[PDB]
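#dry-run=false #mode=assembly
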Amino acid sequence: PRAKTGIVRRRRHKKVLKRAKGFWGSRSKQYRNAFQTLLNAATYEYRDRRNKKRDFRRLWIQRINAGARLHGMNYSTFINGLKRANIDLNRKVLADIAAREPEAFKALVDASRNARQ
Amino acid sequence: EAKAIARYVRISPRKVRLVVDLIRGKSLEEARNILRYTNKRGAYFVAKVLESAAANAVNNHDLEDRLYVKAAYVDEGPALKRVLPRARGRADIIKKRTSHITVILGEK
Amino acid sequence: MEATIYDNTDGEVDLPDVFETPVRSDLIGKAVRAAQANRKQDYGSDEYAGLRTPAESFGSGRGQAHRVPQAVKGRSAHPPKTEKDRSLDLNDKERQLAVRSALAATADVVVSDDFEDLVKTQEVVSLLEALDVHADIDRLFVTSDEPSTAARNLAGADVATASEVNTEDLAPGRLTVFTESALAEVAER
Amino acid sequence: MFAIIQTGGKQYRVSEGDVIRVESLQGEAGDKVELKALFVGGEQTVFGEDAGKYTVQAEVVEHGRGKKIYIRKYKSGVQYRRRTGHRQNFTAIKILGIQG
RNA sequence: ACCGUGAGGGAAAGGUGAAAAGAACCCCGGGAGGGGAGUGAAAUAGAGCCUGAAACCGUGGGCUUACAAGCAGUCACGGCCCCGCAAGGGGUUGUGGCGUGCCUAUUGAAGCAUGAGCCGGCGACUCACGGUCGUGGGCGAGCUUAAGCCGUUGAGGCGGAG
RNA sequence: AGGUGGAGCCUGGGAGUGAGGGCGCGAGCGAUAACGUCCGCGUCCGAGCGCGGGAACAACCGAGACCGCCAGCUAAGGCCC
RNA sequence: GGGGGAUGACCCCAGGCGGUAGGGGAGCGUUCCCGAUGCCGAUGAAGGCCGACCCGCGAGGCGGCUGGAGGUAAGGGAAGU
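#status=ok
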């Protein structure tokens, strides 16, 4: 009934370590805060995990404005007019357009403005 | 190209370190006067580990002069765990940190 | 049923309701178990040492903290306590029971008394070539009262007796034979 | 060759470059299959029209493969004595943009 | 060995190889130690010389660094560098974007409350006899002490006070 | 009666804390003084009731965190930067 | 929980799922005893060193380099985990 756990623990650590890129001076191999720093980073990522998709909701937000206004108006106008829509409703891709295909964008831009006034 | 060395070398790894960090990657003969007429200890030593170096080559690793030190380094190891005044109660030992001494000697 | 008689070309004996029956794994092992059990050994770690020396666990209000365990080689913590009651007396009924149904498993092989006579471990190389295979692999000696002489020695020893030859016995996977007097243990059954 | 319809989720702006697509384990199985995908973003060869003008025709793409979670780890942790770990999910079966 | 006047305490420390065949000779050098040759399956197996990990000190290389804040960092986008799981990813980060470490005890904690300098190994709900419910199952009258006998393996089987 | 729907009751094994505060309200004390304490009615937090807001701020307004980075409507709260 | 499950699994919707003491269920490697008609390895036991297949996971497998000799159990048992 010997338990020389050995070889085992050591491993684990390696484990984490890996989890251990080459982050900040130390932890680097910090078989502790090593481990730690982790936990941290983690959860972080997480919250980041759901985060992003937001950072986007906005990103487009501007690149959007960049145009929405360009022509001559804001995203409480557009929007309103847009939803006046009926067989066509989208936002994301819209942007990355106005920039990709000017005409395209430019377009709706109209059909829009209108829908509105 | 060939190389010189020697462990169980009593001395300030560190100090040593400056040693080369000079004559470092440079013409043989050349630095061969750096350490000849530089200062701080090690030198002496340092010099030495350049002669059995220049030697070894030409002799068994072969084109003289055209040579130099593509690279040079030193490492510490074996200590000398040394005992001193018992905290006037508990022991306080230092360590004459042994000293390795490798160093390249390749031909131009 | 298919109570095959040895000597092969000779007769055939009946299957005794007993063996017949179904099966009872649970008990199965169990029988087992209550085997190794009453049959292992024991051990532990020093009583003297592991609580052997004096000890000056040190005052305190100094820079420390404190003849017991938790600083090296010494102590234990709850080790081999030889005083480790090892037995496990299954239970009569229990036991017997096992072997039974047990054997039952065996059935799934008839040793003519007449054999209780053959006199050389090369007469086994014989009554061998009689009926070999892999199950023989198993094998499993056993006469009926007083073992199958020489029959006892070879590269598969083991000579129970129409009395004394249980699961521990062959029960394991295994495959064997019993001299009538053997099925004299059945009576034991 | 560049259209932008929208599936059980926009996931759009394509034409031919098969676009890793959200699950759909009922029509999919259809290996290199064909199926309709309502439009609403008619952008082809510098000519556009309502995504409501569209909502009439559309396209279709061949049920290509079944991407297997493109790695992605989720260290679920906090100082608050709560840890745990689960790897990516979101796959998906791939399929080219059959345009028309 | 070692601290203790004493009674007493009371450690650490094993491993080359198949066997020495254990490194004649030549080299720089006062030497140790380093360069060749030779043993050799291998000596980065080489004399405290099997495996010989981490921490920690080096030598080169990629990337990166002087109007800049935080251990962290992680989400976005960009350039350099390599594509033995190539039209996808590696590594490093310039920016910006959201971010108060980690453990015990705490009404409540980033903590300026304590715990820890760093790494590796030891190190903490166990065993026995009772009793107690639950469950896996053998008979309903169910069940066995101690012992007697049998015992490569050593094979259990009889014992009926309770 | 019961629209509900999923709590309820008895028998039995295994537990933990046995000292909390914060807010609104109705009372006690208190200089109607205290992030004071003391009882009550609801909530609140519990080392994660983690996220939004109020700059920052357990905690008060809204919210119940199984998981899905380049979807969509709103809450409270906001939209000159 | 419920509608039929063939052993899987598949379909609906109800229905949540934040959680420390602490309660119930399920799994993982660790050194050993089986070898329940089990044995791999000098063209490497094992540990080591490094990785963009398998799993929610704790681990697996598998391929490249190292190193001198072991031990693995398809399944149940045990414990100085």
